[model samples]
Target: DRPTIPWKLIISAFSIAQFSFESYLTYRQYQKLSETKLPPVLEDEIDDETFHKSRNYSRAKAKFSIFSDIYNLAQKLVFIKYDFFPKIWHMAVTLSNAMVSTVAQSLCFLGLLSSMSTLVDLPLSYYSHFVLEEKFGFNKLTVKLWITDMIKSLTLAYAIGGPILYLFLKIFDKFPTDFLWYIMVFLFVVQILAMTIIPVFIMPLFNKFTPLEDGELKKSIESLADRVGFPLDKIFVIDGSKRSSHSNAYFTGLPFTSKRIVLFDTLVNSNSTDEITAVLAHEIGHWQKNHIVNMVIFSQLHTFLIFSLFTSIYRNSSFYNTFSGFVDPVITKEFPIIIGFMLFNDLLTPLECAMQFIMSLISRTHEYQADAYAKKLGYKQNLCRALIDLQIKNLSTMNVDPLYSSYHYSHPTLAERLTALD
Candidate 1:
């Protein structure tokens, strides 16, 4: 008979090792950044132009590093705890669901292209985007333009995403460890480039964008922008109803190269111009406060630390040897390592959850600050009405459990948001 070992001791040791490795990785990333030569002005001190030009590359690297690290750690932990059998079962179920859904949705897109049947895709988009939206008075879509928009989105996804995903899986199989990070970094850069192209090249394929039509709304928005010292000409109204019935607005693109404020047709239809302005004001608050920039920085730092940890742990862990036997050769021999990494992830999930919780707390605070900016713009009532309208339209839970909210929500609960508005 095999001698029994104390399972509790093994678990404790594993936890300690994981924590220590994470801390060490963070320290190394910090040390590297401190030692690197850069411009005299710190990120905060530089103007947006100089800061973005200089910091974007460095920021991207850090973000990619963290993503790799965390993913690797998560994989390893999951592999160790659950082994290959349960992990494969979980993955198979998830992949099957994803494939079926994606293929179904993709087929709907193909149908739209052929014009053989508008009934399937058209109603699917309508029920999700329009009926639900109009129930809360947010829908502004006509069936004609909606179909055109669906075709555009479907075309773009197939054109851009399909080949990229195919290539990514190939690269993943060939170079699971060393080349994965480089590929990830490349994909990140490609994504940023795609963002640059999307608004100018891609988006216009579907919707018509006109400068805000009403002179009064324009003046009010410009006046607020002037007060905040932001340029007003970049603001726009997009016919968002062409695609989704969901009412929303956002600021997009780099600060330069045609940064824009886009208001959805649904948002425009649902609320009065003032309420729409309030929502735009909130979005501008995110930009003005440098929330996106800060988030990018934090994400990069996290990535770098996590990747460094993975490099160290994978080198020494015996868990890999024990789990290697269960891997399917058909998927490639590296499947064992991938499976091992996934196992490690399951074990490390608690720490990741904790980190996410902290990030969510910070995000909620930022939301409050953004709301404050909207209120200060003298659209407090409009903002409040808009929020209520959105909640009703989306059928979002009005009063989610506090415990659940704390664990899951990036923004504060609807009640908390409303209370803040009050």
Candidate 2:
């Protein structure tokens, strides 16, 4: 007999090729942006050199949008095809995994909620506050302050997150096809707005942030910000020592309302100003690269394409009726497309994982580029020392299994980062 290839195998190979080609196009866009000069636009005037660069950036962003569209379309097709399997075994497996994973994650979140709820009475939250943090030499909370913070966090979540979730589910159920993408875009915008506001409003609910009281360290940081062209109005020190020993610094708040760089007090106390500045410079690079804007645009584009595919599938397929079993009636009437999409989402998990792996690799490269930017700003040695200290202080594994790191690590391991710097 002649050898024959399975149709499914051929389809899968074609899908992978399609995805890879699109991803390559996106990569080329970023590469062109890196090499070219800016282009002149109506609102933003630029010299010829800058005009070329700007045009490249615009083209890169457009490529990202196109890639997101194709990726989401492919994911939906996979989902629809998976639903056509004769046996319900795949659905069973997915449902079981979803149940276990959702339950486990919910339980962990509940534990955090419980600790916050009991901040006043049983020393529940304080166990983490006093003992765990103190052991790591990061404790800075009193019982009174801890209780107040807990109340504030709870209130904010209910006030903000509750309505958002409610609206999300409602939109998913009522308009799974036509309205889902719009809702997603709205939600994305709201989230960005929230991130801009949360630092000034919601974050203070948990901890105090006083202006960096240390004179010399403050001046050193201010000078670095000036060099990077960031406004240095205030350097706020967060009392993160109250909750965990972990240390960090980030620029937060809307550009208008209290736009500030917040350093964990623990970080300020533990590392030299130079080390802190290097970390700050890397963060600044993220802004300069317009990563936030790019990410939001990419996500919205994905949602739009995925939902469009789902709409087409649900209108044509009988797979949902056959496989959904007892749940079929309810799902079909209430949220047929969404339930189907959810099932499809499970089937696409492997593909999603692969995309993420590629994205993570890109992210790691960007990190190196950002590190180089820090070096250009005269903070290479300090950044290197800071990376080493962070690894030690956090009890991080010095060397990670490369395969595991590739699958899971969003940022490259300390050793990997250090090697790149060296």
Candidate 3:
């Protein structure tokens, strides 16, 4: 006889515990946001008016976050307390008349689940964009545009996700014992494909990309790129301002591919050529330092670890029985592989949370190194000015709780970065 563990209870407890811990962290951060005085580090760098505005904006966000967090926690609790997964699977079977293949039924189940999730998330998304962001002068999206974005997102999800899911199911069916290795390899292939396809093919579906025209800014960027030995390809400016006034710049493409730089139109409109050049210099520093390669290697290793752990527990029928509440088909027939995978991910939540902290630590370190690289290139003054300007324009939180930032921020907070630069 197999030793029985109350898997459902454990998972429920895990969910509640995680929600409570994160909520506690949020509460601490909210309290920190309420303080009247600025952190001594930021006192001189940020003006009083900007500091107050940033604090107010952050407080509003924190309030919304608490509400949404509770809503999600409630949803998860109900989904677990009830047999939502099994019920949805059964509904998929019935809707398909139990005639379609397992892969088709799985797709149907996913469709229903995702639609429900979207429905549940709709109000929060609407409020966040239309109300919260609008109040902060960041909502550049019209109602029509918002709806259009959602439709495109859903269509892309099904278009790309459906085929990948089908392939995964086939691999599992064909090589039950060796699916682990196969899936890992398959996932890596998909990752690389995504790296290539998303930028070249997919990004244009949402934002307009035009080649940066000949100008002083363009010249400075090219000059900076050359100085850093970056493989400078054509630079493009994305119409990010059409969606939101927030600005960003990034370079994309695989190392072997023609690495191109993209700047937000907002960034170009707001900053000086020197400031823009310094920002790109910081980005090119990431390339020169080989941070991207290191990250890719680290992520692959992490993925292998997660999948290997999943494989160890995958064959245990007990998990399936526990998941379906010892209900029919799972006991008499085979349980759905996708459902089992989802449950495995749920069980790995704590592990994921811990890993996120470590990952952010690595990322922040890379950011520091990149910043230093820009400093070494004699763009330190412009880089600092750009950072502060962006910070003010974006209304980013001025002060952060150390623990809160350590858990949440992948890049160091503004104060931390500015101090490090100094």
Report, for all candidates in order, the number of backbone clashes: 24, 10, 0
Model 2 lDDT tens row, 331-413: 12322333345445543555666667767776776777788777777777888778766755654433334554565567886
TM-scores, each model vs. reference: 0.56, 0.59, 0.94
Model 1, residue 297: C-alpha shift (Å): 1.2
Please provide, for model 1 over 316-336, each residue's C-alpha lDDT reduced to its tens digit, 9 standing for 90 to 100.
233323323554322222233
Question: Which prediction has more favorable lDDT, 1 or 2?
Answer: 2
State the lDDT at 32 in candidate 2: 49
Least accurate 10 contiguous residues by lDDT in model 3: 317-326
lDDT, candidate 1, at 168:
52
RMSD of each: 16.1, 15.4, 2.4
Clash pairs, candidate 2, are 37-52, 37-53, 38-50, 38-51, 38-52, 38-53, 38-54, 39-51, 39-54, 39-55
Candidate 1 achieves a global lDDT of 0.58
On TM-score, the leading prediction is 3
For model 3, residues 99-194, the per-residue Cα lDDT tens digits are: 345534678889889978998999999999999989999989899999898889889999998999888787888888877789888988888898
Put the candidates in TM-score order, highest first. Answer: 3, 2, 1
